Structure formats: structure tokens, C-alpha cells
Amino acid sequence: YTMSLGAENSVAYSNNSIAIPINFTISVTTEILPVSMTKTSVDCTMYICG
């Protein structure tokens, strides 16, 4: 199928109306970031020639 970006949400804009929140949600989200790799060392002489 042709992908859909998101559901349409037409915001009810007018020159004299505002939307004020009456409540809140404390949301905890995860962010995973790589820091280091496996430290590898290669003996060039042994690898090429044994």
C-alpha cells in the first residue's frame, strides 16, 4: 500500500480561542545510546603468516 504519514488532526484555530490543559501525565521514556565497542587487537604477523 501507499504509506500513511499520520492521522489528520485539523487544529481548530481561531483568532480568539485558546486551549488550556487541565491535567498532566508524568511520562518516562527510554533512550538507548551505544557508548563503546569491543576492544579488538590483531597480531598482523600472526594473522598473515602464523
Add this chain to the structure above:
Amino acid sequence: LTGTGVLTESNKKFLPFQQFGRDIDDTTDAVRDPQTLEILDITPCSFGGV
């Protein structure tokens, strides 16, 4: 099949038709002695950085 290594006793039970043993990387890490049908582990010699 030639190489250099430390030959120790092995707990791996080979099938009777199999002679050599390979790891994921297709390197011989287990072998069967031809004279006496016993399995030997081939541990690489302790090469290291100084």
C-alpha cells in the same frame, strides 16, 4: 591437518565418522587422534601483547 596448539583432553563426543572439529569461524579446535580413537581439544598457544 597441520597446525600449532596445545592438545588437551576433550569432553566432546564425536560421531564415529567425524575426525576434525570446527567452531563458527571454520577453525580446527577439536580433533580425533588416528592411532587411538580419542578426542583432543586444540587450544591456541598463549600469544599476547607485551
